[PDB]
Design a protein around this ligand. Structure first.
Ligand SMILES: Nc1ncnc2c1ncn2C1O[C@H](COP(=O)(O)OP(=O)(O)NP(=O)(O)O)[C@@H](O)[C@H]1O
Ligand SMILES: Nc1ncnc2c1ncn2C1O[C@H](COP(=O)(O)OP(=O)(O)NP(=O)(O)O)[C@@H](O)[C@H]1O
Ligand SMILES: Nc1ncnc2c1ncn2C1O[C@H](COP(=O)(O)OP(=O)(O)NP(=O)(O)O)[C@@H](O)[C@H]1O
Ligand SMILES: Nc1ncnc2c1ncn2C1O[C@H](COP(=O)(O)OP(=O)(O)NP(=O)(O)O)[C@@H](O)[C@H]1O
Ligand SMILES: Nc1ncnc2c1ncn2C1O[C@H](COP(=O)(O)OP(=O)(O)NP(=O)(O)O)[C@@H](O)[C@H]1O
Ligand SMILES: C[S@](=N)(=O)CC[C@H](N)C(=O)O
Ligand SMILES: C[S@](=N)(=O)CC[C@H](N)C(=O)O
Ligand SMILES: C[S@](=N)(=O)CC[C@H](N)C(=O)O
Ligand SMILES: C[S@](=N)(=O)CC[C@H](N)C(=O)O
Ligand SMILES: C[S@](=N)(=O)CC[C@H](N)C(=O)O
Ligand SMILES: [Mn+2]
Ligand SMILES: [Mn+2]
Ligand SMILES: [Mn+2]
Ligand SMILES: [Mn+2]
Ligand SMILES: [Mn+2]
Ligand SMILES: [Mn+2]
Ligand SMILES: [Mn+2]
Ligand SMILES: [Mn+2]
Ligand SMILES: [Mn+2]
Ligand SMILES: [Mn+2]
Ligand SMILES: [Mn+2]
Ligand SMILES: [Mn+2]
Ligand SMILES: [Mn+2]
Ligand SMILES: [Mn+2]
Ligand SMILES: [Mn+2]
Lengths: 353, 353, 353, 353, 353
């Protein structure tokens, strides 16, 4: 019957391809997509046609001048439609060729193009945390309605029906992402029951932001299948339960070479000065998360330590002892725009003095 | 839809591998795991990177010094993720290289390294019993809520919908373990309805403890899928129902060779003297199990017989008549740490006088 | 998820094998099994190890002398575990090598070994009837609770959702048995709604008993999957509903050769004389079945006819007209031990005068 | 239909009466009752017939000598049967006239008979706490199954559907008790959601124990109607939730007269010396309750303060400022026998030196 | 059965009375009560005993100094317990006789005692709006879960099953209050489906605050019976749905006499100057309600008109045309403390210049 049709192999019948054009919508936090048929397979982003959508239905243009243009930027294999079908990550422009206010990729692209950044060859691994919720009631997966599970403790990395809610979704997403070609580096159960993580493994410049959005798209499409809701809300349940962040790990050419640990301290130092204006772009709602409790640092203070999860920045035991590595900015909230955060770290770290 | 993604074959798309790093957490009875992407297949434990986790969320380190280090010790095939993906059993260390208080494998490794033990080449077959429970109500599987099934009798090794609860889970685990490469030697329905057994077949020294933990990991992960809870609690329901033990069967080089039956009696003799201090490590809650009824021996007396299930140690009809074999220490409870019990039998049996 | 693991092909991964050792327990009507791993495939019964079980949990030995020994007698392919895995039918012995009181195969083995029996080469086809029940309520499958279906008539060999309850189970069992290598000759819907039949086709001497037990094992294991209960109770519902019997068909070398119909009458004649002592072994509860109504003969009278289903023995139209064939002893109840009935017919028929 | 019969007025039809004889059973914590028809109304306990019950079904006598005798001690009006029908509180004796081991009223009666006690005229007000549970799952009323409500805080004396579970029962019991003639002094919602209190107001000597038992009888009979379970277990849920005590408030003639506050301290002083042996009779399971947290004092220390709920004994602000009053022994657990606790306080306080 | 006991008439049996002492707790927004038995009826507040509660469980005192004292201030008939039983509204004091920080009645009592205020004889009518919610899901009554009803419009003062949710509760509360003796002036369905109103009719000085609290207590106790939740939250659902306010109508001796309309303008004028510091006490969350839309005035502007529901203060058509009357301060939110608002209007209106 129904999954027989969803999983039809089109390769046996024509050469035609399905391309799913993904973009970011008016809120800057809402993913949108639609699909077109293309005459044959494509591997190069710049050999795909540009397209348009109804900007008036995503809060990005008026009705009388409704067209917004889609620039194909990255191609990944579609894990849902399979065969030769593709997901295409997109950029948003007016018909005049201006990037619209909600296109944060443009500005970020410029920074990673800029030659003294590109030469430093920045690397990001970003750890996406998220919470799963029951549809309609909007209460965390596996929690009883109008009630709570046992207190935090057994949940982090746990196993068992009483401890681990929705591995299904998680394990599915992991494979999906790998197949798609997203550089996904790992997953893990998080502290708060119903909370989970994936990390998009060391990825260079713009492609980090690109991957992280497409990873999010795949996540939510998977939840959709499961009849479950995701939030990227930084602190979804108030009280004695963990919030969710998008820890960004970072390194430059000079940082992973000999005596990079001095360049690390130097970088952290710059970050301290601009804490104020980084917090401002590190995602909204963050005040509710960064409280100094629950493995976060207070929004108002800046700090850094070695194995310290109470800090604003953390530098692994391993990269300290090796005099070379990366550091982890724990400040960005789960609803961070990776384009914004990713480039603004490279900016406050290389260009500015 | 959803199982189509969980069961994707990655072999068709990249060389990459998923490694699921397993460890033991702060309670010493709670398994934890998380997963990372590795660039290609691996068969040798010492060719896998060491890793870390958040010790502060497993009750094994403070927040300000949170890192705990993972030493890959054994590799098995992942029966869930399949293809070339692996489970990796692990060991727990401070960044300074000290084994943390809860790492009972280190001490046990030392004893099986020690040359007069290694030479005796000890063999353990351990019989894990466990009980299956309904999620939330926490009442045994196939029992009616706030009520009991018929009295014990038809359940041991039984068959039929009224006698045999959750064979699904059991049969699955058997194959999983075998596929994984765990030396699993057999299974059986236990005396108490909803109680089951598997034996991790004759395995040498450290690898016994390693296999038994990974087998337990796989059991619980399977129950997770079924939406059922496991306990290793030695006596889960009070009254006229069997408890659960982790009988350890044991033999040395000299015990399975000609006239080993004398070395057996000699061993049992030593064991009687140290009963007090063995009971102390044979798992907590045991007082509720070892009552002398229900095929156990009273906690306070030590005994041993031939075909005697009422005894503290038992020696099979078969190994008596053959003047060579193994004996069965029935004392350890189902929530025994096999590292502790497995090495402490070799210790009280070979080294001490 | 779960059936992916139950159905794993182990052939791709090791040579190892799962052997499911089946025996008969304390009541003489309760099947029991457990499984062990064996190092490679096996086709010869006498190349399988002997094993033991806990006789104290099946009511076959005391706790202090608990071991009972298992002698591998027949091998069949496991239809559940598939691949190279096997079911092993067993025999029950004390550690001294005595057959325990409940081992009726030993005695029957002796009779079919005895040379003037073996030479007559006896043949049994036995027709197992059985009734399917809802779990917990214990009321016949497809019957409304605390109520009855339409009166008997449309059910025998019927088809359709209102007439035919649990064909699923039946059809499954048929293939299962065939695959296993049981000589199964046919199946049919019985007269009472929810009642069914299979026949273990012409099988020689001991192997008849052996097959019929293993057929029953496979039946119940299948109902277990379906969450349904079986009874072999000869009259499960009182009143105007059919009971269940285990009709034994029988023939010797001389009976199927020319003018065997005289040897048949001669046999029937002997059977009439020992009706009293045959009824005594033809299974308990039989008084409730054999009432002279519902295609049975009264327990107290012995009779025989040609196409007569009201008779104690029946001789087909076909084997009458051919002067050679078999006859059908309709007296054994569905909970008959085939070892006892099968050998005792050969005994009262050949040896005794 | 059914409540029309339960509530029939018998006064319109005969003079006859129903007496419900209540006693305490073998565990010393289980109430039992049965009813007899008496020819007319009765107000004097000593004009009621003595009766017997089956001591062998309450664990209080062997089968061959099964009779145990019931002595009517107190009469109350039956709030369930209403009209002229009565509850009768009872005392338990052998046919020889010996009080059986589980009759703690006999001993307590002697102490309140004793003239130097009777003259001091002791007064007890006892505050019974208890917890209401869902039938079968045995989880607290208003809690979600396998989960918890919001943390403690809004529940104590609260109102509202989300805060206040089973007022129905509580309010019913209150009126019931008053109607019955139990001197009930007040009720209140307790700290732990689903936990409640009533106080049996200042009552003299023996009649305190008598009223508290009949009060408990009425409580449970009311829950029975509601299909809800009661526990008097001192700490029914482990962790961060209140236990349940039976605070006993106490005063003597001299304590409520001028400068009784000196006699109070003097009494407290004596109580400190016998803390050890009082804890031994203050009900079993108490170790789990008295932890020093949750408004209790640690089992091992004795303390006392003025407005201090963390203490072993507490003396109200009001009775300090007035130089005369009562004090509150907070040590007895909810499953205290009031006969034992009530007399033993008068004993350690008046007779002993 | 159960409502037979809840509704027992105690008047037939003793003279005793149940008094339900009501107070306000630690949040200043949470009502608490408990009940005591009193020896006979009472009509005069100052003939009731003072009482205490556990301040440590309402967040009003530490554990070691836990006692807080209850001053009976007003008596009403208990509509739940009926007969001669009473609700007692209370005041909160330390044992030293200080009013605790959360006792806003003390300060308000002083202001209405003050002779130039008492002489002006102030009158309040306060209109309590509130929203009804489903237990556990916490979604408005009669709304579908994770969805909305038809847009606002048919709901205000409506009738019918699709328009009018929980009239049951409202109508019941109306009678309850009247019976109790609360001067309740009227009720009405509010604009937002599931939202309701009652007005506590012209009441003088302190007794306004007293009645409004007791009214709220009765409301929530009724919802408790219905298994429904109340919120006094000023804007319980975001978006295009009405918030809830506690409009205070107000008049002085001089304002309802000839040419009071000048004293009204004069009063309004004073209120405009102190708008800033009135908003500060008019209840928390108010920023979310007072938006200028949905019949409110913006928090930051002060305004007033005649028939104007968009204004901060409104003066009826009727009292304008009569040159004498009252005005309506629409600024206070539904979670207003009437003690605070009620006195502070009298203060900013009479005493201050
Ligand atoms: N040289 C590098 N520069 C920047 N990021 C890197 C580098 N090497 C690795 N990363 C990674 O960025 C990541 C950080 O991984 P993670 O496994 O989440 O540890 P974590 O900081 O302990 N997280 P958490 O428990 O969520 O607080 C992964 O994608 C790593 O692959
Ligand atoms: N030489 C040996 N030394 C130690 N253990 C062995 C040896 N040979 C076999 N074992 C085994 O250890 C096991 C014991 O199996 P098992 O039959 O379940 O014990 P049991 O006494 O029968 N059980 P129970 O029903 O739990 O009381 C399996 O792994 C056997 O393979
Ligand atoms: N020579 C033979 N000796 C013994 N049994 C035989 C012989 N030939 C055939 N059988 C059979 O034994 C069987 C008897 O089958 P069956 O047809 O079910 O009995 P029935 O009288 O026909 N029917 P019922 O009304 O269902 O009780 C099958 O295995 C037949 O193949
Ligand atoms: N002279 C007295 N001697 C003994 N008990 C008395 C005396 N006078 C009153 N009591 C009382 O004993 C009681 C104690 O009631 P209670 O209201 O619960 O005080 P509490 O210590 O505040 N309780 P809690 O919240 O459980 O800690 C009632 O029956 C009081 O009437
Ligand atoms: N002199 C007065 N001083 C104060 N309040 C008064 C006075 N006279 C009457 N009230 C009243 O205070 C009230 C205000 O009630 P209400 O009739 O609902 O006003 P409303 O402005 O129509 N309501 P709304 O739809 O909520 O905006 C009632 O109790 C009136 O009887
Ligand atoms: C557990 S952790 N990921 O190491 C700490 C992160 C945490 N979930 C947070 O962002 O608040
Ligand atoms: C039946 S048995 N496995 O021989 C005895 C083991 C039993 N379940 C126990 O109490 O340990
Ligand atoms: C229909 S039939 N198989 O010929 C008769 C068998 C019947 N159920 C019996 O109990 O003998
Ligand atoms: C409010 S209270 N009765 O003072 C608290 C007492 C608590 N339930 C106890 O464990 O004794
Ligand atoms: C009908 S009405 N009271 O004028 C509307 C008032 C509205 N519920 C408010 O936000 O105050
Ligand atoms: Mn991480
Ligand atoms: Mn994390
Ligand atoms: Mn991190
Ligand atoms: Mn075993
Ligand atoms: Mn076992
Ligand atoms: Mn064993
Ligand atoms: Mn047949
Ligand atoms: Mn048949
Ligand atoms: Mn037949
Ligand atoms: Mn109290
Ligand atoms: Mn209390
Ligand atoms: Mn108390
Ligand atoms: Mn109004
Ligand atoms: Mn209104
Ligand atoms: Mn109004």
């Amino acid at each position: 019957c129904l999954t027989d049709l969803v999983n039809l192999n089109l390769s046996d019948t024509t050469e035609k391809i399905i391309a799913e054009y993904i973009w970011i919508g008016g809120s800057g936090m809402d993913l949108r997509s639609k699909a077109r048929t293309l005459p044959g397979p494509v591997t190069d982003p710049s050999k795909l046609p540009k397209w348009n959508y109804d900007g008036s239905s995503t809060g990005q243009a008026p009705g009388e001048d409704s067209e917004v243009i889609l620039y194909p930027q990255a191609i990944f294999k579609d894990p849902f439609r399979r065969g030769n079908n593709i997901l295409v990550m997109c950029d948003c422009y007016t018909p005049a060729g201006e990037p619209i206010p909600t296109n944060k990729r443009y500005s970020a692209a410029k920074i990673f193009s800029s030659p003294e950044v590109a030469a430093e060859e920045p690397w990001y691994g970003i750890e996406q945390e998220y919470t799963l919720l029951q549809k309609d009631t909007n209460w965390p997966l596996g929690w009883p309605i109008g009630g709570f599970p046992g207190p935090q403790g057994p949940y982090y990395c746990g196993i068992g029906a009483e401890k681990s809610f929705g591995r299904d979704i998680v394990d599915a997403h992991y494979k999906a992402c790998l197949y798609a070609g997203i550089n996904i580096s790992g997953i893990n159960g998080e502290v708060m029951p119903g909370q989970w993580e994936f990390q998009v493994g060391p990825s260079v410049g713009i492609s980090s932001g690109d991957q992280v959005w497409v990873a999010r798209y795949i996540l939510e499409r998977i939840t959709e299948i499961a009849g479950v809701v995701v939030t990227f809300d930084p602190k979804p349940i108030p009280g004695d339960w963990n919030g969710a962040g998008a820890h960004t790990n970072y390194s430059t050419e000079s940082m992973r070479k000999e005596g990079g640990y001095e360049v690390i301290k130097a970088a952290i130092e710059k970050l301290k000065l601009r804490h104020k204006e980084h917090i401002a772009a590190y995602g909204e709602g963050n005040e509710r998360r960064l409280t100094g409790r629950h493995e976060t640092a207070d929004i108002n203070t800046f700090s850094w330590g070695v194995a310290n999860r109470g800090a604003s920045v953390r530098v692994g035991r391993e990269t300290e002892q090796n005099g070379k590595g990366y550091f982890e900015d724990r400040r960005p909230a789960s609803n961070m725009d990776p384009y914004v955060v990713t480039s603004m770290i490279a900016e406050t770290t290389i260009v500015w003095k």
